[PDB]
Design a protein around this ligand. Sequence first.
Ligand SMILES: CC[C@@H](CNc1ncnc2nc[nH]c12)NC(=O)CC1CCCCC1
Length: 167
Amino acid sequence: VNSFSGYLKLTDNVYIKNADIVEEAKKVKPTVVVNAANVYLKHGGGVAGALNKATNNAMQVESDDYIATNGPLKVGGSCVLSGHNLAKHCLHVVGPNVNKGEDIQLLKSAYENFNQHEVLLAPLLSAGIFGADPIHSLRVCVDTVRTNVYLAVFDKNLYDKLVSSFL
Ligand SMILES: CC[C@@H](CNc1ncnc2nc[nH]c12)NC(=O)CC1CCCCC1
């Protein structure tokens, strides 16, 4: 038993809710919150800008030191950093950004990072400002992630469409 509330059950291991990931994080304080990152860990908008704003920019400061030491992430890759005031850890995961021309096949690789963590609070990768089909992202999630994932979808209208089309 965990502390996530009002999630609809999609599969054995995938749950979904119409919620702002920042508000879910602040209420739950999960072990892992997933950030929808880019390779430079420049957290400007969408999930990344919203989480970073909620950390008072501490996420960005930590991320800049990470990049200065390690260089950019790979598309499809990830790193574990602090969750600051939102979670124990933040798993920064880079899904492909279709609005930049990146291979959508890399979305499966991105979701594979979730399997290194038993339970995660996460957004829909590559969707929203990253430009990919959200129904496809949810499908890849369900077909790739084997650990327990609690998906927070910000847009109400999209959430209704995702559930109603899941089948
Ligand atoms: C589906 C991914 C999600 C990612 N963004 C966020 N996901 C969770 N919590 C967040 N808090 C702040 N941003 C958050 N984007 C949205 O839902 C917005 C809709 C995308 C399609 C077109 C209509 C808008």
